[PDB]
Amino acid sequence: VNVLASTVSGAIERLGLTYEEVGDIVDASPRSVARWTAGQVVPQRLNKQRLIELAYVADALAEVLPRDQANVWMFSPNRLLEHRKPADLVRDGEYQRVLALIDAMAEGVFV
Amino acid sequence: VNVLASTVSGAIERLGLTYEEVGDIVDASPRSVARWTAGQVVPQRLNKQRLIELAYVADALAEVLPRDQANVWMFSPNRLLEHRKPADLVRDGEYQRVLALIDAMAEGVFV
Amino acid sequence: VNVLASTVSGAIERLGLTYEEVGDIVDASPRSVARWTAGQVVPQRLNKQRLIELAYVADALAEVLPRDQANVWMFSPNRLLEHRKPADLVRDGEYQRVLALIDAMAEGVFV
Amino acid sequence: VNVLASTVSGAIERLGLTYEEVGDIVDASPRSVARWTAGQVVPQRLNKQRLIELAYVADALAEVLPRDQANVWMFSPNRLLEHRKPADLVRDGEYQRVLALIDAMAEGVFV
Amino acid sequence: VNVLASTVSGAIERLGLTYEEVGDIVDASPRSVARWTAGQVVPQRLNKQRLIELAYVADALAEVLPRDQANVWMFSPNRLLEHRKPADLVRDGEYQRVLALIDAMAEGVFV
Amino acid sequence: VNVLASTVSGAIERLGLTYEEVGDIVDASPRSVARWTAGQVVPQRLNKQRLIELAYVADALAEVLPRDQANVWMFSPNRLLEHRKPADLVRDGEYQRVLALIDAMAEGVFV
Amino acid sequence: LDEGLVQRIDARGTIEWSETCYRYTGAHRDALSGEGARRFGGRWNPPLLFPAIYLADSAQACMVEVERAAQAASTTAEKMLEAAYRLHTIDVTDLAVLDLTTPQAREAVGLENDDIYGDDWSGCQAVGHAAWFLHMQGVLVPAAGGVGLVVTAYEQRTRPGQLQLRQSVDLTPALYQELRAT
Amino acid sequence: ALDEGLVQRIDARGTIEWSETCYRYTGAHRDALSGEGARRFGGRWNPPLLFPAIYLADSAQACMVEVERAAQAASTTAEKMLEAAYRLHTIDVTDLAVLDLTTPQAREAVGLENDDIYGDDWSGCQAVGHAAWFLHMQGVLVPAAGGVGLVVTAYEQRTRPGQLQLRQSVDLTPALYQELRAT
Amino acid sequence: LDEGLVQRIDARGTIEWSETCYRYTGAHRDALSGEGARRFGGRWNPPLLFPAIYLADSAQACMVEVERAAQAASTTAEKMLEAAYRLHTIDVTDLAVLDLTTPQAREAVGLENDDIYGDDWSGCQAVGHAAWFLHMQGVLVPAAGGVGLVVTAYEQRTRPGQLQLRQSVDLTPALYQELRAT
Amino acid sequence: ALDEGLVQRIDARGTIEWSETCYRYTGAHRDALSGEGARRFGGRWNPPLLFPAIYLADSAQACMVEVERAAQAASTTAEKMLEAAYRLHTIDVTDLAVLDLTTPQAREAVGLENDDIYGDDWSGCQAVGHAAWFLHMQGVLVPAAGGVGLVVTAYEQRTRPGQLQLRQSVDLTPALYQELRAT
Amino acid sequence: LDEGLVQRIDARGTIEWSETCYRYTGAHRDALSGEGARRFGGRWNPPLLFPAIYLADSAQACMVEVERAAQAASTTAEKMLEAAYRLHTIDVTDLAVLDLTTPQAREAVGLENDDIYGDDWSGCQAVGHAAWFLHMQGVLVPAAGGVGLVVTAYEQRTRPGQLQLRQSVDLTPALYQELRAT
Amino acid sequence: ALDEGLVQRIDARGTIEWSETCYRYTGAHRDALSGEGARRFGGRWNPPLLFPAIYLADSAQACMVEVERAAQAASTTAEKMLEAAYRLHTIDVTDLAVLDLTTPQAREAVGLENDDIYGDDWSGCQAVGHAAWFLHMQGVLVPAAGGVGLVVTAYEQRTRPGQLQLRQSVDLTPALYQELRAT
């Protein structure tokens, strides 16, 4: 397995995201996500940039929440993000805003 | 009270708009509208350009309708504006079209 | 009757479209479509470019389906067009995609 | 000669424009302009909308300047139009601004 | 002199900019800048947002360069900004990039 | 050397392009192009999409011009492309138009 | 600007029309101004190209238009006329107009009932535009209560005295009810 | 923008009541009191698209100077321009409540200098005219190249009966222009 | 254009394939044209890059495709074939093709059942694109009724006689029902 | 646009039935009767993306002249271009219903002049070819630099069996080109 | 940047404030970093212009903020603190701050209860921005559990020793429950 | 992009554990261990907006050379730049797991040459630093104009207690710069 794929796979695994969840975020079938993270060839549609961005967010989020709560956080409407889910922001290319929020959480910014 | 604020306040008052109504048009809280028109400091979100545009429309409208009917007109779907409310046009930056209609009304243009 | 109008009229007639159907595709009243195809003056709104595009599609479609089925095809959600109706594609300026599909149909492309 | 072409041609000739000048404003060859204004068929590129807009301007301009000066004015950098030529505004779709300036001229607006 | 103008003016003077230089950055005449910074009324065109952004940059820049060199730096093509002048970035709305470069300078980032 | 790079490289060499010429078309340094086509790692900027599009064009062009003339043709202002060079169209994302012209050449379209 | 439409309208040509006409405006407005119709558009003129004045051939027909404007403003004529309006009596003399007062004339330029009564002005506006384009002085049109007159680019197109303000009176609720009557 | 500071300063200046026999020129077909052209295009002392405005001078001679300036902006001369049909309107103005900018003190108070008044840039004057209109002033009295100018803003809505009264209209020929320019 | 996918497809390489194949077209179309698939795309080719011809390894398998096209056009084969179509018998000789007729071969290039049956063509199209990119002459694919052949850029890539039209007959409703049979 | 006036004029001209032995050149791998290239790019006498079109000349010599013109647009010569593999197709045309633009009267009637036919701008010719196709004409007979050209539009849909018949295809070498260009 | 607001804030001026304060961060973060608030924004600072540090005037008040952050992250303080956080004790000395701890002071700069409790930060952010703009060292604010301190651009604006880290301890669930208590 | 090939190659190189006394300069008001500036702007060896990064040199002299290079990019000299308040930090680095690019073999393996390291274009170095950080390496050891550089990436999250230890900070005056640049 190529190291890029296993590194991304490791980041997502520590968040406990399912292949279905990852698929909805990176616009790919669950099987395509499973194959990609296993380092197999994927001719289908799959947004690699979104997968890497998801990995950034998963790793960053582990600093501020334990796995269970981190997982739930991804799919919970967040009043700090105008009642949007962080998973949807990542899906739609706004991972930087999610990373900013996580850094605020890590610095104990009063909400 | 600064004269810019009291002039705008005077224009809106002659139309009998509530602070809630004005707030929905200029994207501000009713309290922020109340404070602004009273010439007090307003650090919050408030679109000054929209407030002035609303004032233009209120003053112009007084030429063609009495207060009661002018007030209602602002919030009534107008078939001459593709069944949109003049208040919504003002809110969304289309005050010029509303001013054009008022001038047509003032010139007895056949509808 | 001018030949441009009668040529377009001929193309649509062979598809059996009603003036109501044509009107919804070219953004005109049924009466305006009836007058235009009869070569009469039409001061009203009518998108001539869309009418010609519709004619292109009607003529092309006759190569691959008989009249009854061609007519129905125009208004049937097509899975090859992401479950959109060919009539709606024509209406919205995407006649070229519809012509491409028809040419694929004419070449027996496996679907 | 059809009345539309005849009317547009009359406006052009009264201003004394050459077909080369008109061609540059309406994005056509001089021969195409000559043929169009003579009511003859023109399969080549010609922006009819611009020809009509130019006729508007030519006719309006006659109210405020005599022929020879009107002609010069079309091609003179005008400080009221940010040092642009009225003919270039017409070419580039800004005929309305030119008509507005002519109206101001006709009302003796101080410059 | 109102405190806003006084504060912005102080930042400008510490950097030693001329009102002609400031005028070019904020799209105003030199007289308009002089009057604005003196807290006097300015009915002419002046981009207040740009004046404030320039004050941000001037104040930030003082952390990393002494006055005379700070001044030269504003007008020197900078290879870290794709050979553009910081003053031109500020003029064109890119003050954030300039502030980011100053922060990198202040942190001894290797170039 | 991976087969993708080998295949693209073959197309380039058959046309006789220099790595400087290729670099200009694909927005890369000549060294980056040389390394990429040699299947070596390239961390620097390189537009892979443009390299592939250039390979399409080079291979297509071989059908209609021999090597030396094909090479000259890429850098010759072409009246069929509004006096632009095919290489510049490829650089700027318009390779499809270039392929379409090559197809017309291959079908003896009268020019 | 349709060649066929312009051709057809030219073929109809004009008639010279004289009548005592009526217009209402806000009390402050000039009885012969047409800038309002230019700024917004009207049923028989596109916006932005030329001033246009709308008149009726009787006070009664004018009052019907007052009522229609009131209705569009979501109120009644009596309430609308609490704001200061004036009724103008304007003599029109030998105005060269396109006569669209018959269904045959309207059909000849492609207009039918939906065009004159319905919400879509595009047809009537194109016809008014073409008439103005041909230097006609106006268009005679059906009006809910009688005959309407649309005068296009009055200032440029008309000779001395073709339009003459004869009278202006306050259009009170009382005057309206009096004039509206059968 | 409609700057609060400028509005406040202009309000502080207030108005004076001004009466004078004034002069305006228009194309021969235009109404002497129409202000729609200034609204459509803008004028030195008014932004476009908000209100009608009428430009008058305080003498026939000052009016002729403005005819020259317009001719010059049109790349020609008053003598040639007036070959097209224009008319000269004599308009009596009575008790018009105007912002008085004829003094240098007043112009300094609202941030204007001669550059604003004669230079190519109208922005400062337009902001000032905008504010005066916004404050319901009936107009602005301004310096002009040939004397004093009056800008009357939203005349129809803002003036009582007979504040502006058309007294006379005459054909403004090249010969008359030269006569009035001298005398 | 994925480096890994191209690498993997190259590793599979080609086989030389000969078979009597079948295609249907509109009666006016050239039996060996592939521009339709280029203009629109097909399951095994992206649009706009190269012509592609779709063939079946039996008349029966071809009729299944007729039925599938009819279904996509919201009708039946019998009704669709009221329009003039023709059935072409085309001999294929020594064509160098990527063999994807086994699930193992398909799995090796990352394709599974959803890819061959489902609405998303992206996987099959990427594989067809890579095969064409490597100058393979075509792709052997599963076809609802048997084996399908996708011939990519026929004109350029093939030698004299590799594809030969042997026969063309009117594809009537009667011929369809006859050939469709078990 | 598809101008009503142009369509009407072309319809008024109508068609003639034309039969001739004609010539076309293509890359050696291309079908003699394919018209997809003209559709993809456009040609002098057809807009792109609407219909296939085939360009033929009325003699081998006229065809060679077109080979030269294409070579020249490709910045080279027929002699060098034909080092790449091309073939010359002899195609019999029978009773093709064509718009006849070989006379100056006909070209004048549809607004075309020599500039349109040989100049860099294809727009006029393309509009005319578009209209002929739109009117279901089978093609357009045109002047060409070396003789007469035939543009056959949507051949597949619009022609009866055997109206176009491929008689012969030969390799178009530089030597053959020179031979045919002369003889 | 409102002239009136800046004027009004200048008029209030600053007070010199000294207190032992408390902040919590992730265990790896620097106790005096303010980049997080800069990247995202906070109630009392717009994003992107300056670092800002949020502190509370007691451990209890700080724990209330821990709870509020947990709530915003859709969980509880006890669960959130399963991830490694640390509680910092930071002595603040003679910090020149805008004192907004009274409703009168807040009203003077246009802030009311909705501004300090509601979802719209725009008012508080504008006030914090103006304070930083005037080179104030911070803003004293109401905090759900007591007094909050927002230190703006610490590194630039403060003298040696004005902020001093005195202590850092693991903020475990146990420490939280202990400190949260009444 | 985050190229798979580059990531694989860098992983194959792996890390070494590096210990040295290193040097960094900052404005006098900045924290010796903060890496936010490199994150906000980017640095030669890191893309912006993803992670903090700290740039250190392996001697005071090498650090002074970097002060010169920054001064030069700022159109001035170290002597003049250091009139603004800067400080020189001595930072002990212990067992940092770093990608070692100090050898030419290593630089060749990841596609870098001297052009990448000293030229105006940072893209290649940034991609390499990005990948090292992505692979959870603690930093990159690089050649520098005056010796060896260390780029420490996401220090706070990725280092065990005391891997970076601030030993000393002194005012970096023009005089000290000249002294350290020599000695």
Side-chain angles (χ1 to χ4, degrees), chain E residues 31-32 35 39-45, chain H residues 6 108-111 113 116 123-124 127:
Chain E
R31 180 167 66 93
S32 291
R35 285 184 55 83
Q40 306 167 304
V41 62
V42 179
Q44 298 87 356
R45 47 174 265 278
Chain H
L6 178 69
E108 173 54 44
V110 300
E113 293 198 336
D116 297 295
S123 71

PDB file of all heavy atoms in Angstrom, chain E residues 31-32 35 39-45, chain H residues 6 108-111 113 116 123-124 127:
ATOM      1  N   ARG E  31      -4.710  66.828  -1.647  1.00  0.00           N
ATOM      2  CA  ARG E  31      -5.432  67.746  -0.772  1.00  0.00           C
ATOM      3  C   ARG E  31      -6.501  67.012   0.042  1.00  0.00           C
ATOM      4  O   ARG E  31      -6.699  67.301   1.222  1.00  0.00           O
ATOM      5  CB  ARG E  31      -6.090  68.879  -1.560  1.00  0.00           C
ATOM      6  CG  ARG E  31      -6.850  69.841  -0.649  1.00  0.00           C
ATOM      7  CD  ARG E  31      -7.257  71.134  -1.339  1.00  0.00           C
ATOM      8  NE  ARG E  31      -8.228  70.910  -2.403  1.00  0.00           N
ATOM      9  CZ  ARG E  31      -9.547  70.973  -2.242  1.00  0.00           C
ATOM     10  NH1 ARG E  31     -10.067  71.256  -1.051  1.00  0.00           N
ATOM     11  NH2 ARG E  31     -10.347  70.752  -3.276  1.00  0.00           N
ATOM     12  N   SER E  32      -7.187  66.065  -0.592  1.00  0.00           N
ATOM     13  CA  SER E  32      -8.210  65.290   0.109  1.00  0.00           C
ATOM     14  C   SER E  32      -7.608  64.459   1.248  1.00  0.00           C
ATOM     15  O   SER E  32      -8.215  64.321   2.319  1.00  0.00           O
ATOM     16  CB  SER E  32      -8.966  64.397  -0.878  1.00  0.00           C
ATOM     17  OG  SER E  32      -9.773  65.193  -1.740  1.00  0.00           O
ATOM     18  N   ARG E  35      -6.601  66.933   4.114  1.00  0.00           N
ATOM     19  CA  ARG E  35      -7.796  67.383   4.827  1.00  0.00           C
ATOM     20  C   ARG E  35      -8.397  66.276   5.698  1.00  0.00           C
ATOM     21  O   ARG E  35      -8.767  66.526   6.848  1.00  0.00           O
ATOM     22  CB  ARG E  35      -8.853  67.898   3.847  1.00  0.00           C
ATOM     23  CG  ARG E  35      -8.521  69.274   3.271  1.00  0.00           C
ATOM     24  CD  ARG E  35      -9.644  69.817   2.371  1.00  0.00           C
ATOM     25  NE  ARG E  35     -10.942  69.869   3.042  1.00  0.00           N
ATOM     26  CZ  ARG E  35     -11.341  70.852   3.847  1.00  0.00           C
ATOM     27  NH1 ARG E  35     -10.543  71.883   4.104  1.00  0.00           N
ATOM     28  NH2 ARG E  35     -12.541  70.800   4.410  1.00  0.00           N
ATOM     29  N   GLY E  39      -8.748  65.908   9.918  1.00  0.00           N
ATOM     30  CA  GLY E  39     -10.082  65.813  10.483  1.00  0.00           C
ATOM     31  C   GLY E  39     -11.088  66.768   9.867  1.00  0.00           C
ATOM     32  O   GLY E  39     -12.159  66.997  10.431  1.00  0.00           O
ATOM     33  N   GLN E  40     -10.750  67.324   8.707  1.00  0.00           N
ATOM     34  CA  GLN E  40     -11.643  68.239   8.000  1.00  0.00           C
ATOM     35  C   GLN E  40     -12.564  67.500   7.035  1.00  0.00           C
ATOM     36  O   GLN E  40     -12.269  66.377   6.611  1.00  0.00           O
ATOM     37  CB  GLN E  40     -10.835  69.287   7.236  1.00  0.00           C
ATOM     38  CG  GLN E  40      -9.838  70.040   8.090  1.00  0.00           C
ATOM     39  CD  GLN E  40      -8.857  70.827   7.251  1.00  0.00           C
ATOM     40  OE1 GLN E  40      -8.177  70.271   6.390  1.00  0.00           O
ATOM     41  NE2 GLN E  40      -8.796  72.130   7.480  1.00  0.00           N
ATOM     42  N   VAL E  41     -13.675  68.135   6.674  1.00  0.00           N
ATOM     43  CA  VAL E  41     -14.651  67.495   5.799  1.00  0.00           C
ATOM     44  C   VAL E  41     -14.097  67.318   4.375  1.00  0.00           C
ATOM     45  O   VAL E  41     -13.418  68.196   3.845  1.00  0.00           O
ATOM     46  CB  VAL E  41     -15.977  68.292   5.763  1.00  0.00           C
ATOM     47  CG1 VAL E  41     -15.760  69.685   5.211  1.00  0.00           C
ATOM     48  CG2 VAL E  41     -17.022  67.545   4.958  1.00  0.00           C
ATOM     49  N   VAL E  42     -14.362  66.156   3.780  1.00  0.00           N
ATOM     50  CA  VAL E  42     -13.884  65.839   2.437  1.00  0.00           C
ATOM     51  C   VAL E  42     -15.024  65.290   1.569  1.00  0.00           C
ATOM     52  O   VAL E  42     -15.339  64.099   1.621  1.00  0.00           O
ATOM     53  CB  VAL E  42     -12.723  64.817   2.483  1.00  0.00           C
ATOM     54  CG1 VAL E  42     -12.237  64.468   1.077  1.00  0.00           C
ATOM     55  CG2 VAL E  42     -11.568  65.367   3.333  1.00  0.00           C
ATOM     56  N   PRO E  43     -15.650  66.158   0.763  1.00  0.00           N
ATOM     57  CA  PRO E  43     -16.744  65.683  -0.100  1.00  0.00           C
ATOM     58  C   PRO E  43     -16.239  64.931  -1.327  1.00  0.00           C
ATOM     59  O   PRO E  43     -17.019  64.238  -1.982  1.00  0.00           O
ATOM     60  CB  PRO E  43     -17.448  66.979  -0.507  1.00  0.00           C
ATOM     61  CG  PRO E  43     -16.325  67.992  -0.504  1.00  0.00           C
ATOM     62  CD  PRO E  43     -15.466  67.612   0.666  1.00  0.00           C
ATOM     63  N   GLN E  44     -14.948  65.063  -1.632  1.00  0.00           N
ATOM     64  CA  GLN E  44     -14.372  64.429  -2.819  1.00  0.00           C
ATOM     65  C   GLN E  44     -14.153  62.940  -2.604  1.00  0.00           C
ATOM     66  O   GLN E  44     -14.230  62.453  -1.469  1.00  0.00           O
ATOM     67  CB  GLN E  44     -13.041  65.094  -3.203  1.00  0.00           C
ATOM     68  CG  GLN E  44     -13.159  66.569  -3.576  1.00  0.00           C
ATOM     69  CD  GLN E  44     -13.070  67.491  -2.372  1.00  0.00           C
ATOM     70  OE1 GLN E  44     -12.984  67.034  -1.231  1.00  0.00           O
ATOM     71  NE2 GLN E  44     -13.088  68.799  -2.623  1.00  0.00           N
ATOM     72  N   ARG E  45     -13.875  62.233  -3.701  1.00  0.00           N
ATOM     73  CA  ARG E  45     -13.568  60.802  -3.673  1.00  0.00           C
ATOM     74  C   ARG E  45     -12.382  60.466  -2.778  1.00  0.00           C
ATOM     75  O   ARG E  45     -11.298  61.037  -2.916  1.00  0.00           O
ATOM     76  CB  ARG E  45     -13.288  60.288  -5.089  1.00  0.00           C
ATOM     77  CG  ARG E  45     -12.337  61.173  -5.891  1.00  0.00           C
ATOM     78  CD  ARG E  45     -11.975  60.563  -7.240  1.00  0.00           C
ATOM     79  NE  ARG E  45     -10.724  59.807  -7.194  1.00  0.00           N
ATOM     80  CZ  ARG E  45      -9.508  60.345  -7.286  1.00  0.00           C
ATOM     81  NH1 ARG E  45      -9.361  61.656  -7.433  1.00  0.00           N
ATOM     82  NH2 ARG E  45      -8.432  59.570  -7.239  1.00  0.00           N
TER      83      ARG E  45
ATOM     84  N   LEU H   6     -20.193  65.876   6.371  1.00  0.00           N
ATOM     85  CA  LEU H   6     -20.564  66.855   5.348  1.00  0.00           C
ATOM     86  C   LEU H   6     -22.001  67.309   5.492  1.00  0.00           C
ATOM     87  O   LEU H   6     -22.299  68.495   5.351  1.00  0.00           O
ATOM     88  CB  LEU H   6     -20.350  66.286   3.947  1.00  0.00           C
ATOM     89  CG  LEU H   6     -20.741  67.188   2.771  1.00  0.00           C
ATOM     90  CD1 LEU H   6     -19.784  68.388   2.669  1.00  0.00           C
ATOM     91  CD2 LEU H   6     -20.754  66.383   1.479  1.00  0.00           C
ATOM     92  N   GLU H 108     -14.868  76.903   1.783  1.00  0.00           N
ATOM     93  CA  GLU H 108     -13.882  76.266   2.654  1.00  0.00           C
ATOM     94  C   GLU H 108     -14.560  75.395   3.716  1.00  0.00           C
ATOM     95  O   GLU H 108     -14.061  74.322   4.073  1.00  0.00           O
ATOM     96  CB  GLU H 108     -12.997  77.320   3.320  1.00  0.00           C
ATOM     97  CG  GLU H 108     -12.043  76.763   4.371  1.00  0.00           C
ATOM     98  CD  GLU H 108     -11.177  75.628   3.847  1.00  0.00           C
ATOM     99  OE1 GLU H 108     -10.643  75.750   2.724  1.00  0.00           O
ATOM    100  OE2 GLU H 108     -11.030  74.613   4.564  1.00  0.00           O
ATOM    101  N   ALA H 109     -15.703  75.856   4.210  1.00  0.00           N
ATOM    102  CA  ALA H 109     -16.433  75.134   5.246  1.00  0.00           C
ATOM    103  C   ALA H 109     -16.949  73.782   4.756  1.00  0.00           C
ATOM    104  O   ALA H 109     -17.112  72.856   5.558  1.00  0.00           O
ATOM    105  CB  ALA H 109     -17.588  75.984   5.761  1.00  0.00           C
ATOM    106  N   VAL H 110     -17.208  73.651   3.451  1.00  0.00           N
ATOM    107  CA  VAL H 110     -17.674  72.362   2.929  1.00  0.00           C
ATOM    108  C   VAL H 110     -16.598  71.615   2.118  1.00  0.00           C
ATOM    109  O   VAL H 110     -16.896  70.635   1.441  1.00  0.00           O
ATOM    110  CB  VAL H 110     -18.962  72.526   2.065  1.00  0.00           C
ATOM    111  CG1 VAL H 110     -20.080  73.139   2.908  1.00  0.00           C
ATOM    112  CG2 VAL H 110     -18.713  73.369   0.803  1.00  0.00           C
ATOM    113  N   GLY H 111     -15.355  72.085   2.188  1.00  0.00           N
ATOM    114  CA  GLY H 111     -14.233  71.368   1.607  1.00  0.00           C
ATOM    115  C   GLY H 111     -13.994  71.560   0.118  1.00  0.00           C
ATOM    116  O   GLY H 111     -13.296  70.759  -0.504  1.00  0.00           O
ATOM    117  N   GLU H 113     -12.726  73.871  -3.318  1.00  0.00           N
ATOM    118  CA  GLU H 113     -11.795  74.898  -3.776  1.00  0.00           C
ATOM    119  C   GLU H 113     -12.028  75.100  -5.260  1.00  0.00           C
ATOM    120  O   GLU H 113     -12.869  74.423  -5.848  1.00  0.00           O
ATOM    121  CB  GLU H 113     -10.347  74.507  -3.491  1.00  0.00           C
ATOM    122  CG  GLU H 113     -10.010  74.468  -2.006  1.00  0.00           C
ATOM    123  CD  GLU H 113      -8.516  74.509  -1.733  1.00  0.00           C
ATOM    124  OE1 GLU H 113      -7.729  74.124  -2.624  1.00  0.00           O
ATOM    125  OE2 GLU H 113      -8.128  74.940  -0.624  1.00  0.00           O
ATOM    126  N   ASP H 116     -12.334  72.236  -7.618  1.00  0.00           N
ATOM    127  CA  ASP H 116     -13.574  71.486  -7.627  1.00  0.00           C
ATOM    128  C   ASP H 116     -14.570  72.121  -8.572  1.00  0.00           C
ATOM    129  O   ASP H 116     -15.338  71.433  -9.233  1.00  0.00           O
ATOM    130  CB  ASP H 116     -14.167  71.404  -6.224  1.00  0.00           C
ATOM    131  CG  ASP H 116     -13.270  70.662  -5.269  1.00  0.00           C
ATOM    132  OD1 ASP H 116     -13.067  69.449  -5.483  1.00  0.00           O
ATOM    133  OD2 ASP H 116     -12.750  71.294  -4.322  1.00  0.00           O
ATOM    134  N   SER H 123     -16.784  65.376  -8.485  1.00  0.00           N
ATOM    135  CA  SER H 123     -17.214  64.580  -7.322  1.00  0.00           C
ATOM    136  C   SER H 123     -17.521  65.413  -6.076  1.00  0.00           C
ATOM    137  O   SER H 123     -18.544  65.207  -5.417  1.00  0.00           O
ATOM    138  CB  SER H 123     -16.169  63.515  -6.964  1.00  0.00           C
ATOM    139  OG  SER H 123     -14.995  64.081  -6.403  1.00  0.00           O
ATOM    140  N   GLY H 124     -16.644  66.354  -5.746  1.00  0.00           N
ATOM    141  CA  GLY H 124     -16.851  67.166  -4.560  1.00  0.00           C
ATOM    142  C   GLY H 124     -18.095  68.023  -4.632  1.00  0.00           C
ATOM    143  O   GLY H 124     -18.910  68.028  -3.699  1.00  0.00           O
ATOM    144  N   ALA H 127     -21.240  65.830  -4.373  1.00  0.00           N
ATOM    145  CA  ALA H 127     -21.528  65.395  -3.013  1.00  0.00           C
ATOM    146  C   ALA H 127     -22.186  66.522  -2.231  1.00  0.00           C
ATOM    147  O   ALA H 127     -23.109  66.291  -1.446  1.00  0.00           O
ATOM    148  CB  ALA H 127     -20.263  64.935  -2.315  1.00  0.00           C
TER     149      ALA H 127
END
